[PDB]
Symmetry: C3
Subunit: 333 residues, 3 copies
């Protein structure tokens, strides 16, 4: 009887950060209560000032990472304020039935709904809006995020021994299809409905104009670089709701990788790069061994360095000359 279970309210945080949780469940099964407010907003996605009408869960692209344990109940209050213009809904790939919830959560501006589902399968999973007849338009407007369903006993390696992260980040990767004029210039629009009228043609090229982490070119760089220390264990959850990606930590590895995101499977070891299919979340665990700057990319390097799918880590600590050293620094002789 679900009414006899504990309820716990979670307040979500902005990606790439992740709300506080326990890896190993410190209670029995609970109803975990989340609230997300839909926000349609203009967003500037590149250094040039290109503006799109983003469709967001909780004001961000991606939407925030939700975290529960296997056989918890997720109870989501989804709010569509009357300041918005479109109907929206939510499909959880973690959930079973009713198109992942999409059939039960259609909210017009000025409406709200509350969905409950049982998180029966452990893993990271995409969630995304999916209104009938407008599915790729909403997803590729940014209206997607992810949920992590941890095993109740936390993460385990390929031999059954604990894997415990010290830090967790959520990298949402977004393909955008900004329509162009005949010469190749990106259009701007006053409303999402105006933007929609060029959108299907732009999408059907299957060629994104931009591919970004955390909603913009350069978002995970500078003062917003990801951080770690030598010795620290970091889990990077990575989602792509619509298009394949191939994550790679430049100067590191995925020591343990669930490339398709599902923790009942043993992780792949020692990956350089891995394929997260479109419509999936994946997760990589790494223990840092060297300080300095890393880049974290989609390793189609055009998509990374020309279209925006690149972020940085800044890692503190002790350089290991056993692991790597410059024997003769660049010089002319």
């Amino acid at each position: 009887d679900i009414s006899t279970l504990p309820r716990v309210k979670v307040d979500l945080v902005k990606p790439p950060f992740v709300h506080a949780h326990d890896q190993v469940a410190k209670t029995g099964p609970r109803v975990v209560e989340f609230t997300m407010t839909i926000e349609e907003k203009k967003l500037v996605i590149d250094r040039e000032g290109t503006e799109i009408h983003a469709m967001t869960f909780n004001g961000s692209v991606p939407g925030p990472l939700m975290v529960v344990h296997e056989n918890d109940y997720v109870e989501l209050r989804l709010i569509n304020p009357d300041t918005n213009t479109l109907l929206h809904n939510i499909d959880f790939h973690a959930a079973t039935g009713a198109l992942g919830g999409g059939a039960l959560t259609q909210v017009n501006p000025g409406e709200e709904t509350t969905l409950r589902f049982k998180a029966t399968k452990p893993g990271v999973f995409v969630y995304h809006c999916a209104p009938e007849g407008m599915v790729p338009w909403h997803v590729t407007s940014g209206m997607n995020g992810a949920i992590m369903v941890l095993p109740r006993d936390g993460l385990k390696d390929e031999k059954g021994q604990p894997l415990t992260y010290d830090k967790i980040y959520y990298v949402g990767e977004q393909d955008f299809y900004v329509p162009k004029d005949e010469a190749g210039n990106y259009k701007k629009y006053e409303t999402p409905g105006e933007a929609y009228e060029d959108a299907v043609k732009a999408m059907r090229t299957l060629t994104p104009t931009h591919i970004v982490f955390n909603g913009a070119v350069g978002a995970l760089t500078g003062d917003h670089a990801l951080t770690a220390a030598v010795g620290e264990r970091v889990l990077v959850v990575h989602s792509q709701a619509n298009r394949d990606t191939r994550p790679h930590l430049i100067g590191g590895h995925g020591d343990y990788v669930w490339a398709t995101g599902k923790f009942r499977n043993p992780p792949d070891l020692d990956q350089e790069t891995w394929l997260i299919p479109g419509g999936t979340a994946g997760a990589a665990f790494y223990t840092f061994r060297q300080p300095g700057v890393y880049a974290y990319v989609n390793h189609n390097l055009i998509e990374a360095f020309e279209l925006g799918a690149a972020g940085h880590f800044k890692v503190t600590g002790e350089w290991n000359d056993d692991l790597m050293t410059s024997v003769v620094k660049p010089a002319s002789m």
Copy 2:
């Protein structure tokens, strides 16, 4: 001595259905006799009336699913009637030698051939036509299907315990490259040879115009939706002879997935989405837990909902409110 083995004749059925077979082999090794007749035909592939010249095995796109057991012999009588205009052949990815059979099966209109191969490796496998110098043209005209080579003891899970399906469907996914005029309009042609003259240029864009299940937009919907009941175990075999796909059951999962199709490997568990590389067949097992409408898609949602890679299930039975429920239905307060 193969002449001492039983011969069994199979009559094939139209996809997405699958000819009757036994999961666990009820005889020893056999010579399993199949006949396929090649048919070049006009097909309408979308709601708009776009017509292509399809090159088919047995009148369908995809070609029918053939089913045998490991170490059976497949004996295929391939017929190319003189009503056709082109040379064709067949390459089985299940087979060993002679380009999978392609080097031994070149049939002009008015000819037939019979190929025999030993099915030495268990899995689902693509078969496709592959005439020298014209390979992608025939494949992307629809001339591809799949063969399932079951282990003699049937399917097993990641721990070695039986997996027994109640129902099986075959979803062939086809990328088409319909040539356009300068403004973007799709051309029609009177013959396959006329169509061929614009085909290489269209293919070289690497951008399909259409991506469909069972040969047309909407083919697996309406009166032709796939069906199941709550509690039923369903195996969905999915092939793509030329281009990657990423299958996803909207509102479900792949409980057990052989994403690259080969049953000596343990399946991946609890997949949301998986990557079937171009040139591969994959297979997903799911036990339905909720009634209602599901969609089954390529989860590049543009490819699904704009280009045609989407079908439906209609599932009967008892809704499970433990698994999912609307706590507060959409409303304004």
Copy 3:
């Protein structure tokens, strides 16, 4: 203390061949010394005479395969002669820290550098140039190769038993983005810097003009076909530094495949086709069972047979009619 270890000098050979090595380490850990000389050169990449300015390690596309054992030290002397025009560097995906070495190896024309790293993880790995702000341009100009880090006890199967290859080949697959005029014609240029000015636009289409093995259409065919005999065990290492591929042996299989290249993981068995993500090396083991001509392709058959991602094997020996036979040769009746 690294100064107490043996040093061994390796002289590299041109792909698809691989320098001589021992599968099972016959010494303890060593410092393995390699020298590569950067060469910018014009290369003709197709049958039509299309010319690009290739940026090469050691004169070839791909760069040569380097082979060491786990916990050896790789010591690379990288030479950028003053006959070249650009700054280059090298990132090893096998290495840990400093962007895989890229941050420590920036060499102007007329300079050299020596990098040492510890090969702590077994597998095949991409290496590539990666100059800040010019990364995809150098990679997609051919400036990439691979390194194999063998386990000290050689390769093992999915049950822990030895896998010993008789022959090894390295297939580097290269996506090129040759800029076109308005009508679609490929441009030529006198220098790499002239070519660079159209390069970012060509890359941003995400649509290669050419996709080739060993640096040109048809490179691994004719007098340069790969060879084997019936019964021989062959390891094919395959890399793609920038873009996904899907290797397939036409008429064979990957009996054991590390599709993402890392030998601490059990191989996938009996693959028809597998996905090597862009930014990865993979490796397939096959024992030939039939003589004759095979093709080895990227199984996007357009990329194979129209854009150049196709090579051949010529295999000697005894045809096995149990495995495959023509029962009735093509004929009209």
